[PDB]
Amino acid sequence: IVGGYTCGANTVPYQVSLNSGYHFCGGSLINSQWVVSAAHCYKSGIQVRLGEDNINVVEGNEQFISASKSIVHPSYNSNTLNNDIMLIKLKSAASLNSRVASISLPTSCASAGTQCLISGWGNTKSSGTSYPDVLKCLKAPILSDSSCKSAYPGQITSNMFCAGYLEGGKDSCQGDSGGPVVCSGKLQGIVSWGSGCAQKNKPGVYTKVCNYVSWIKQTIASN
Ligand SMILES: CP(=O)(O)c1ccc(C(=N)N)cc1
Ligand SMILES: [Ca+2]
């Protein structure tokens, strides 16, 4: 997260860190046994870490659980990043309390103009590199599909939306990938891609979760 603020420990309870020896992507807890992330975050050997603030210190509220299975969307295209969404089932259910909570799936798509909360442990600079130890947050609006398509000609599909500031300076970044975009208490997006981070006229591109609700529910109902 470039240009954001320190969230505060456990103030984003559905935020997860995907660890394979080190933090490599974010994700969101959608029920006690399932996590949603970006398909471009896929790897074998994922350990899911819940209840994290400082990912380098054990502070007392963590639950580290291994994944028993991961399911990349059937239509994921790694060249275009269309359908950049994956499901990860945990080996055992997480214990839910006020600091580890699921985030509700959307019942409708959110509109341009809606303000959302984006969070993650990714890079905090647009030029160099500086990864934070504690969770960063950014409030940003969903942009209109026209400006989104204007910023990225021939690249935005109906499964994507832009959120951010055209002026630059505030955006998600590398390391935030797979993380949540929550608007009015519902998971609306997944940190997916963008050109560089926080550049002028290159807002962040997010997977449009409302389009995948049926696929998520039935996949979890059969696995
Ligand atoms: C494909 P990725 O995971 O490296 C990524 C994700 C988000 C951005 C951004 N918001 N500018 C840039 C790159
Ligand atoms: Ca920790």
Sequence-separated (6 or more) residues with CB below 8 Å from residue 23: 17, 49, 55, 121, 175
Q: Are residues 110 and 205 in the same domain?
A: yes
Per-residue b/e over 74-87, b at no fewer than 16 CB within 10 Å?
eebeeeebbbbbbb
172 annotated as ligand-binding: yes
Atom of ligand 1 lying closest to residue 38 CA? 3
Structure tokens at 127: 């030029």
117 and 202 inside one domain: yes
Do 8 and 109 have their domain in common?
A: yes
Q: CA angle, corner 70, sides to 68 and 71, nearest 5?
A: 145
Q: To what resolution in angstroms was this structure determined?
A: 1.8
17, 37, 40, 73: which is the annotated catalytic residue?
40
What lies within 8 Å, CB to CB, of 144 at 6+ separation is 112, 113
Nearest ligand 1 atom to alpha carbon 205: 10
Q: Give the range of the structural domain holding residue 153, as residue numbers without chain letter.
A: 1-12+103-210
Biggest CA-to-CA distance, the chain: 47
Q: Examine the domain organization and report whether 8 and 39 are in the same domain.
A: no
How do beta strands 15-19 and 115-120 pair?
A: unpaired
List 28, 70, 177, 192, catalytic entry: 177
Split into its structural domains, the chain has a count of: 2
Pairing type for strands 15-19 and 23-31 reads antiparallel
User: How many CB atoms sit inside 10 A of residue 187's CB?
Assistant: 24
Please give the span between the terminal C-alpha atoms of the chain, in angstroms, as a whole number.
Answer: 33
For residues 150 and 89, membership in a common domain is answered with no
Query: Which long-range contacts (C-beta less than 8 Å, at least 24 apart) are formed by 210-214?
Result: 210/106, 210/108, 210/109, 210/110, 211/109, 211/158, 211/159, 212/73, 212/83, 212/85, 212/159, 213/105, 213/106
